[PDB]
Amino acid sequence: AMSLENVAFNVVNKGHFDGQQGEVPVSIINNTVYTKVDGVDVELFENKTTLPVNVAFELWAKRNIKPVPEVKILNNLGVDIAANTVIWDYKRDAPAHISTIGVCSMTDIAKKPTETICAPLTVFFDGRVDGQVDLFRNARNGVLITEGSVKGLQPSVGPKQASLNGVTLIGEAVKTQFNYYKKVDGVVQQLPETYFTQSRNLQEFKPRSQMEIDFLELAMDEFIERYKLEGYAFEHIVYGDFSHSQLGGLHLLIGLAKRFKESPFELEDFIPMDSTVKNYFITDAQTGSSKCVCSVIDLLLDDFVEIIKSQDLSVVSKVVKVTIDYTEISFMLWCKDGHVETFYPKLQ
Amino acid sequence: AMSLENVAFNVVNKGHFDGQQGEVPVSIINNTVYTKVDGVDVELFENKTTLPVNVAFELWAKRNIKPVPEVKILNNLGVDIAANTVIWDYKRDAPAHISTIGVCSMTDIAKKPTETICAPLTVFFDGRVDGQVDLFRNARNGVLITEGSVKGLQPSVGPKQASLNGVTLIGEAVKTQFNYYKKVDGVVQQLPETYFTQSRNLQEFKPRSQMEIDFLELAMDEFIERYKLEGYAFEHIVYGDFSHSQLGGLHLLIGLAKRFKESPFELEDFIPMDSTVKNYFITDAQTGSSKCVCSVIDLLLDDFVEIIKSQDLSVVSKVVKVTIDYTEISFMLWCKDGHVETFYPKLQ
Amino acid sequence: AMSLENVAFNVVNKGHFDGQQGEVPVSIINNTVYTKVDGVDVELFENKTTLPVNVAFELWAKRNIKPVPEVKILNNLGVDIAANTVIWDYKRDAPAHISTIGVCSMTDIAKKPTETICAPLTVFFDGRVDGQVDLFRNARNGVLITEGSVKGLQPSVGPKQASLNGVTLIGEAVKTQFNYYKKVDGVVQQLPETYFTQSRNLQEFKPRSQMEIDFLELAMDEFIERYKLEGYAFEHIVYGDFSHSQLGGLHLLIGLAKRFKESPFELEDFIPMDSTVKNYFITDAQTGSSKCVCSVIDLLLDDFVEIIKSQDLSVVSKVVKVTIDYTEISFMLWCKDGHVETFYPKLQ
Amino acid sequence: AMSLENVAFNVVNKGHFDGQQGEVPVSIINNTVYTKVDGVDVELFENKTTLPVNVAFELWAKRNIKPVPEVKILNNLGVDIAANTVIWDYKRDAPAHISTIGVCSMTDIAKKPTETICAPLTVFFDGRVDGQVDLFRNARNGVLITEGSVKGLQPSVGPKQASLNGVTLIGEAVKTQFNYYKKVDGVVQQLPETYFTQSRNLQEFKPRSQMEIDFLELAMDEFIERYKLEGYAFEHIVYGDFSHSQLGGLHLLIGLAKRFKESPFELEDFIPMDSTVKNYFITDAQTGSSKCVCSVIDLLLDDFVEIIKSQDLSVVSKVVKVTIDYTEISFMLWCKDGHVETFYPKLQ
Amino acid sequence: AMSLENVAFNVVNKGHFDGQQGEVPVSIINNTVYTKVDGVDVELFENKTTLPVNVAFELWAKRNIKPVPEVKILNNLGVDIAANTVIWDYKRDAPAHISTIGVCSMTDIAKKPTETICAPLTVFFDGRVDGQVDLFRNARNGVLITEGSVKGLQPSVGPKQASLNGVTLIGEAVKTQFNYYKKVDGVVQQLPETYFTQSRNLQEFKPRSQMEIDFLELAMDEFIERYKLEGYAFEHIVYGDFSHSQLGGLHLLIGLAKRFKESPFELEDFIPMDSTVKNYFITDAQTGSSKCVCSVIDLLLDDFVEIIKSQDLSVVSKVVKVTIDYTEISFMLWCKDGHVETFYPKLQ
Ligand SMILES: NC(=O)NCc1ccco1
Ligand SMILES: NC(=O)NCc1ccco1
Ligand SMILES: NC(=O)NCc1ccco1
Ligand SMILES: NC(=O)NCc1ccco1
Ligand SMILES: NC(=O)NCc1ccco1
């Protein structure tokens, strides 16, 4: 007995949609949902989506409140739709997927993922929900996450972190590391060997290794000395060059975090969404050095160091494909006289 | 079990809210309510009110579909709120009253009119609904309509016409003439002697008397000759003078209807609402004669002749108070040498 | 003492802005202005402009309520702004000009047209307002309209019709024929010889000559016989050809009006504005003959016969420039063997 | 002479409405008020209310800029409307009350609180404004605040803090502690003996006692040791349990503030308004422990300690009613073997 | 080949408009521009302007990404429009100017600044763009900025800081100090001798002199002692008096920054725009001292000290005009017995 008033009742009483019965009076004004709390209207939801306000309200209330894969992972895996849940994209304030399966009558393409409409779409299955491993086995296309072993299915250990209600974290009270499985045209596809982005912030960047502790504490020339990084252009790539009008390098989040403690800078996120590689229009406030498209990736410094050190430095310029977050990230390697000039996530 | 989806279900299946169970999928976009009909959205309601779109949708769906008093009558009687119904104002595309009683949880001030909040307000009671005559008897303030006699209560025979779903008509299959009763502070009132406006349209004006048939068929000087209207300025007041830049007179709907058959004109209804007297910015398309505020009243021509004939034509200018539709309508009488110069609903 | 509440007071009490003092309570919701009339909101204005709702409300309330030149005439004369008035464009539900002079503080570029900002702009002056003939004499650029003679200034007799509150009419109670004067860079211009469009409607088309009476009453081959129009393609140009999938000709409003009495058709006005030549996507409902861009001009049939009769019918195709409404209208003349094939307002 | 342009003039020149004369040109676009400052529009107000944009602009400009009671206090006291002022709810970006008394013609139910419409409503009176103590004496329903003694009226000393322009503070340059008085149906009602919430923030939480200094500085088991809090479940209730998927306890703001220094967490305020007890959907970022409805109250730790220590621990579960902010806050006490299991503001 | 889809392509691929060819599918919803990134909409721009959403999107994408003069400087110089660029006002989230020159067809008054429409307007020229010095020489009105010498043109050294993408900074990798030139009616106007505001923030205020280091570190009476500021009311003017209900003085940003470290306060920026002198409704959170209009100027403390020390203290009250940011800032000097009582940017 689905209704706007019942969704609002659940938001008010349960903090989210929890299948409870009841209704609260709602008023909809423009793109905002309100509820009368003792005579005055209290805002429950502000629609930031391209969907109708009441439709987005229900989808947001029916969002998965369990730790789920980050949208970038789901996207790199080709996920089109989720099975009997809504993955909320907190970075875009919108549902990660256009349609639903057994969630909301306005966005539903099917009630069960076994319906023919779902066969050509890569449905996301959560092995933590009863019957979803079997639904994945019978689904023509899908992505499955589990907490343990699935008999006969070869696992792909995913990232340590998951998104819980918009918070990217490595779980201690909850499991955030999942086993990943994919199916393309009824066939279980072998997921590639891959690195994972660390999903850290600039404001609260914490080192996750001794090399990262040394990078943040030590001076530039003495960190490079310790880790044998001479001839690998870390001064340009990771530390960044703020001497000319165009900002040089600065493509690893760890290098932005180090700069951040000394002096502030503006990162204009002109395509605000979750992605393995992010693009920013960066303006350094101390020097005035700036760059319209500064591609930034949050790799564990040891992982980036391993990627660059295992590259041949004999060619002037080549494309270096690295599998990060299950996707092939093309990088652009530029060399001269046996030393790296620059190495950056390739702008397409 | 009130819900947006259930109201929409009733609109879709029953043409209005009919207490039926069921839900249809709704999407709200801006000020418009839509329903999915086999994949595509179909518009159900366009909010023209100052209330939230979903709230106005429910009030409109819960409108009285029986012949009810015209909003102008209810307004002249001081009606603030209706009992367990919504009087839809089709001229304003909005509810006639701000609040409701046992209709919609967002607009309800009470569920039953017997609650203390309703005592100071003039509640509208419909004797055609079971128990409303008694509720009126125990209500401090109220206006009652009945089809027949109420024991002990002296009636006021209201207008012949009522509004059925926005159509003002004199019923043949339905009763449209009601008995009116009013109570102020527990005291049953003696409703004054009143004339009634005929609520006719310009496009479909029909004469309701022999004098009105003669006015529409006969020429100006020969109608006035027949009805001894010499010296009462009907040439100015009713027929209208289109010879000067400012349109002279034309204050009776019958005179606008007669002009309408010969040549067209524009009536700009700058305050669109139901009222005993209406104001228009009239532009005559044939001559170009115009007037910013031309007050127009639809009185039965015999009634308007009785009012003008029962006046003292000896003062230059005076205010002539006439009870029309239960309200006191001030008119402005202008005379010279014992003859009327002009007589029009007072602009104030 | 300009205010939203005062403008609304004038709209409510005077039918338009009339410099009266007073205020009424206003509420603005989306693009609509409302006023409280005894507890409920009554719509006063719906903004159809690209200006802010309160700004457009004031400009509309301050519109010229006297018969004024049609927007197409003002436009063909290069009028940029009006002096101390607002010419309301009733076809676009918007002000005819972007800025004002001494009208509204939000749109005003100057209070008086004598200010330097107005010198490069063609200010519209109305000789019917005290002091505007003199203001025109001292204005560098301007267009003047008068009812009678201006000493020393040679006049151009404008069209018979003017727009009074959105109604295009030939005045009987008011003067609608003006004398036109134009000045470019201080030099009084000699306005060219021009024809005028008749500004008629399809629903209420009235013949303004004996040739037009004969065209509407007589049959095709017998009207052409009477007026010696053999070889001038009137069967195609004026009457229209509805035998093929593409509608042939039908470029003169008189021919659309004649078709209209027999069978209906849809005219999609895809660029809704006032112009000498209008373009419509016409679909004939009887035959299904249609045309995406059917240019239509309302010329007096005698004027259109004079234009076609005074052409050289010896070249296959040429551009025929005709001055209509003071503007140069290009027509496309197509001939074969000394007879007209087609003649239509040039699509460019 | 109230107007949109005059309100805007006062906002621009006086920082708020100050009864000054003058007008500034305003443009209204969507839900935003703008003023032309040297040719370009500058935003003055963004409507976050369910009221029309110009109406909310005036109410916000006419907000009380003196230290006033917090909305939660006014709400717990049953305040419906304020007398000749607007209490701005800075937490909801909206007026605390639906209607006004002698403030704005669009929201006014009366000009003076002595009018009959105000008798059934609890009007808020400010003894700091001349004549408001007397108005309270003659008001059937009301809440009064004073800075000192009112002859014959028994006072209720309120909270130390008040809201000054959105800032909750304990005044030093201004008085923030008021005397409270209430009237229900013409009878002065004895306000209850009550505790008060401390109205602190998480970001800037400061201890207001030695017990609170000890709680924030000392370790868990050594604070409990010092204050004899063994067997009272402070480890669960105040400190919080982040070991399981559902976050245990954490119902006192002081415990959230202590957690905040060590590790961050997200508090989703799904009903954003001022209330004695607040509900949050909390997600701990370090552990991933979370709770959909975590009720949180900011009591002085000594006050909470006194509340819990004065409870009988013989029953498995009972409702414990505590008067906080003049309202009866129901708590749920759970015990086992003579020790407290949990104690939390009861979810209704 | 300008288009919405091409602007969006440039925003997506180049971080801003860069003249590149290509199109990305766009959807416009309300006041927001979106792009489909793998099936879901990603927000590219939120219109905060009074211009149409697609128009403001193009202007923002076409904003000057080089260090440009701060809007307050341009405004004090009388700049109306920029030549072949858009100066984005990041404080108002809108273009600094109403119209453009060769930027966007919807806002363009001309394609080149040499067109007659531009002659009466003060066009902004950037000597760093080829041909703009010459365009300034031929422009009737204009403001020019250069990086070096212009033959024959007497320079005015401007402020050290410029705005680069919204960031006010003193350039190290880029030049931010420009030479300024002005022309009024074809005549090069001598720019006045002036002080400059330091354009600092409260959150990140850094001293730019030894006097400013001493002010922030030293106590009140010992700073005044060192700098001989006795009898100059710095205790009131710069430090601020928080003892009475109305906040005393506090008109220099350095004094707000010093207060900020000790205790927080709210600055309501009721006219949010760039100006030499800013007005705030300040509420001190510790004391509750407040002021509706507290004018604040960010002058280098040495510059303010020099301004006040060079004033005659013989008159009770006088207007002190100081040229700051090329504009005459009127200050109000109040004296008694040879000592300063108060000195503040004069409220007009
Ligand atoms: N990342 C990873 O461990 N891939 C191995 C795999 C096995 C089956 C699917 O992927
Ligand atoms: N309020 C008032 O004056 N009412 C008049 C009345 C009371 C009873 C009958 O009429
Ligand atoms: N700008 C221009 O070329 N104007 C033509 C003109 C000037 C005077 C009379 O005509
Ligand atoms: N909180 C408190 O002090 N109550 C006592 C009281 C006296 C009159 C009304 O309340
Ligand atoms: N500020 C300044 O240096 N003014 C001198 C000047 C010379 C020409 C124009 O201004």
Closest CA to A65 of D250, D263, D292: D292
Query: Ligand 4 in contact with D184 (CB < 6 A)?
Result: no
> Which residues of chain A are within 8 Å of residue D98 when distances are taken between CB atoms?
39-40
A154 is written with which tokens? Answer: 């070869």
Chains with 3+ CB–CB pairs under 8 A to B are A, C, D
Between CA D344 and CA D252 the distance in angstroms is 9
Between CA A84 and CA A86 the distance in angstroms is 7
Closest CA to D57 of D91, D102, D9: D9
CB B317 within 8 A of CB B334: yes
CA distances from D39 to C106, E50, E95, E134 (A): 9, 12, 11, 27
State phi, psi for E220 to the nearest 5 degrees: -50, -65
Between CA B159 and CA B325 the distance in angstroms is 8
Percent helix, strand, coil in chain A, to 5, is 20, 30, 50
Block residue for tokens 């920029």:
E82
Q: What is the DSSP letter of D315?
A: S
**Catalytic residue status for D251:** yes
Alpha helices in A171-300, H assignment, sequence order = 210-217, 220-226, 234-237, 253-262
Amino acid at D307: I
Between CA E4 and CA E27 the distance in angstroms is 10
Resolution attained, angstroms: 2.3
Between CA C255 and CA E66 the distance in angstroms is 61
The ligand placed nearest to the CA atom of residue A181 is 1
Between CA E299 and CA E197 the distance in angstroms is 5
CB E34 within 8 A of CB E28: yes
Closest CA to C68 of C124, C16, C18: C124
Protein residue with least CA distance to atom 5, ligand 4: D156
**B344 among annotated binding-site residues:** yes
* Residues in a beta bridge with E179: E146, E157
A51 is written with which tokens? Answer: 């969907």
Between CA B57 and CA E63 the distance in angstroms is 44
Between CA C295 and CA C327 the distance in angstroms is 16
Between CA B271 and CA B268 the distance in angstroms is 9
SS3 call for E272: coil
Between CA D52 and CA C41 the distance in angstroms is 11
Between CA C197 and CA C179 the distance in angstroms is 17
D54 is written with which tokens? Answer: 């110009």
**B294 among annotated binding-site residues:** yes
In angstroms, what separates the C-alpha of B112 from chain A's closest C-alpha?
A: 18
Interface test with D, best of E29, E98, E290 (most D CBs within 10 A): E290
Between CA B127 and CA B83 the distance in angstroms is 11
Say what angle helices C301-309 and C210-217 make with each other, to 10 degrees. Answer: 100
Q: Rounded to the nearest 10 degrees, how much is the dihedral formed by the CA atoms of E102, E108, E112, E116? A: 180
Between CA E142 and CA B274 the distance in angstroms is 59
Q: Which of E150, E154, E184 most suits a substitution to test ligand 5, by most atoms within 8 Å of the C-beta?
A: E154
- Give residue ranges of B with CB < 8 Å to any A CB: 1-6, 23, 25-30, 34, 36, 52-55, 105-106
DSSP-derived secondary structure for C46-104: E--SSS-HHHHHHHHHTB--S-B--HHHHHHTT--EESSSB-EETTTTEESSSSEESS-
Phi-psi region of D184 (alpha: psi -120 to 50; beta: other; left: phi over 0): beta
* Residues in a beta bridge with E27: E34
SS3 call for B25: coil
Over its C-alpha atoms, chain A yields an Rg (Å, rounded) of 23
**C112 among annotated binding-site residues:** no
Between CA A13 and CA A9 the distance in angstroms is 6
User: What residues contact residue A106 under an 8 Å CB cut-off, 6+ apart?
Assistant: A51, A52, A55, A58, B25, B26, B27, B36
Between CA A216 and CA D20 the distance in angstroms is 58
CB A71 within 8 A of CB A91: yes
CB A23 within 8 A of CB A6: yes
Under an 8 A CB cutoff, do B52 and D52 touch? no
Between CA A326 and CA A196 the distance in angstroms is 8
Over its C-alpha atoms, chain E yields an Rg (Å, rounded) of 23
C336 is written with which tokens? Answer: 């074969």
Closest CA to E130 of E114, E146, E154, E116: E146
Between CA D319 and CA D331 the distance in angstroms is 6
For D33, the closest chain E residue by CA position comes to E50
Q: Pairing between strand E277-284 and E290-297?
A: antiparallel
Alpha helices in chain E, H assignment, sequence order = 4-14, 53-61, 71-76, 132-138, 210-217, 220-226, 234-237, 253-262, 301-309
Contacts of B101-106 with CB under 8 Å at 24 or more apart are B103/B59, B103/B62, B104/B2, B104/B55, B104/B58, B104/B59, B104/B62, B105/A23, B105/A25, B105/B2, B106/A25, B106/A26, B106/A27, B106/A36, B106/B52, B106/B55, B106/B58
Between CA B87 and CA B347 the distance in angstroms is 29
Block residue for tokens 């001190």:
E284
CA distances from A203 to A164, B49, C89, D199 (A): 19, 47, 56, 28
Between CA A62 and CA A112 the distance in angstroms is 16
Protein residue with least CA distance to atom 10, ligand 1: A191
B26 is written with which tokens? Answer: 């709704």
Under an 8 A CB cutoff, do E169 and A285 touch? yes
Strand order in the sheet with C327-336: C317-324, C327-336, C339-345
Interface test with A, best of D279, D283, D294 (most A CBs within 10 A): D283
Percent helix, strand, coil in chain B, to 5, is 20, 30, 50
Percent helix, strand, coil in chain C, to 5, is 20, 30, 50
> Which residues of chain D are within 8 Å of residue A173 when distances are taken between CB atoms?
242-245, 284, 287-289
Between CA D28 and CA C300 the distance in angstroms is 46
C233 is written with which tokens? Answer: 């393609």
Q: What are the E-state strand segments in A286-348?
A: 290-297, 317-324, 327-336, 339-345
Query: What is the Å distance from ligand 1's center to A324 Cα?
Result: 13
Between CA A297 and CA A293 the distance in angstroms is 13
Between CA D157 and CA A188 the distance in angstroms is 72
State phi, psi for A182 to the nearest 5 degrees: -135, 150
CA distances from A71 to A62, A75, A161, A331, B118 (A): 17, 6, 12, 22, 54
- Strand (E) or helix (H) holding E279: strand E277-284
**B146 among annotated binding-site residues:** no
Query: Which atom from ligand 4 is nearest to the alpha carbon of D193?
Result: 1
Closest CA to A297 of A164, A227, A173, A199: A199
How long a stretch of residues is chain E?
348
A284 is written with which tokens? Answer: 């350094």
In angstroms, what separates the C-alpha of A85 from chain E's closest C-alpha?
A: 17
- Give residue ranges of E with CB < 8 Å to any A CB: 11-16, 18, 27, 29-30, 34-35, 37-44, 65, 67, 164-167, 169-174, 176, 204
CB D312 within 8 A of CB A188: no
Q: Rounded to the nearest 10 degrees, how much is the dihedral formed by the CA atoms of D291, D293, D298, D299? A: -100
Amino acid at A83: A
CB B315 within 8 A of CB B335: yes
CB E276 within 8 A of CB E327: yes
Under an 8 A CB cutoff, do E293 and D11 touch? no
Task: Count the neighbouring beta carbons within 10 Å of the beta carbon of residue A77.
Answer: 23
Instruction: Give chain D's end-to-end CA distance (angstroms, integer).
Output: 49
Q: What is the DSSP letter of B241?
A: B
Q: What are the E-state strand segments in D249-288?
A: 265-268, 277-284
**C287 among annotated binding-site residues:** no
Between CA A30 and CA E30 the distance in angstroms is 10
* Residues in a beta bridge with C169: C162
Amino acid at E81: I
The ligand placed nearest to the CA atom of residue E159 is 5
User: What residues contact residue B333 under an 8 Å CB cut-off, 6+ apart?
Assistant: B311, B313, B315, B317, B318, B319, B320, B340, B342, B343
Closest CA to A4 of A32, A24, A20, A30: A24
Task: Count the neighbouring beta carbons within 10 Å of the beta carbon of residue A293.
Answer: 15
> Which residues of chain B are within 8 Å of residue C171 when distances are taken between CB atoms?
287-288
Angle at the Cα of B73 (from B67 to B74), degrees rounded to 5?
80
A214 is written with which tokens? Answer: 């040394």
> Which residues of chain D are within 8 Å of residue E245 when distances are taken between CB atoms?
173-174
Task: Count the neighbouring beta carbons within 10 Å of the beta carbon of residue E323.
Answer: 14
Under an 8 A CB cutoff, do B29 and A52 touch? yes
> Which residues of chain E are within 8 Å of residue D165 when distances are taken between CB atoms?
266, 268, 281, 283, 290
A237 is written with which tokens? Answer: 């790539």
> Which residues of chain E are within 8 Å of residue C52 when distances are taken between CB atoms?
50
Angle at the Cα of C164 (from C159 to C167), degrees rounded to 5?
85
Query: What is the Å distance from ligand 2's center to B78 Cα?
Result: 13
**Catalytic residue status for B339:** no
In angstroms, what separates the C-alpha of D117 from chain B's closest C-alpha?
A: 8
SS3 call for C254: helix
**E62 among annotated binding-site residues:** no
Between CA C307 and CA C316 the distance in angstroms is 18
A219 is written with which tokens? Answer: 């001076």
CA distances from A47 to A44, B292, D52 (A): 10, 45, 19
Between CA C56 and CA C52 the distance in angstroms is 6
Exposure string of E74-88, with b = 16+ CB inside 10 Å and e = fewer, is bbbbbbbbbbbbbbb
Protein residue with least CA distance to atom 4, ligand 1: A156
- Give residue ranges of E with CB < 8 Å to any D CB: 30-31, 48-50, 75, 80, 89, 92, 94-98, 242-245, 264, 266, 268, 270-273, 279-281, 283-290, 292-293
Residue of B97, B182, B183, B236 marked catalytic: B236
Between CA A185 and CA A141 the distance in angstroms is 6
Angle at the Cα of C208 (from C203 to C214), degrees rounded to 5?
90
DSSP-derived secondary structure for E41-92: EEEEEE--SSS-HHHHHHHHHTB--S-B--HHHHHHTT--EESSSB-EETTT
User: What residues contact residue A160 under an 8 Å CB cut-off, 6+ apart?
Assistant: A170, A176, A177, A196
Task: Count the neighbouring beta carbons within 10 Å of the beta carbon of residue A109.
Answer: 16
**Catalytic residue status for D321:** no
Under an 8 A CB cutoff, do C117 and E116 touch? no
Query: Ligand 2 in contact with B190 (CB < 6 A)?
Result: no
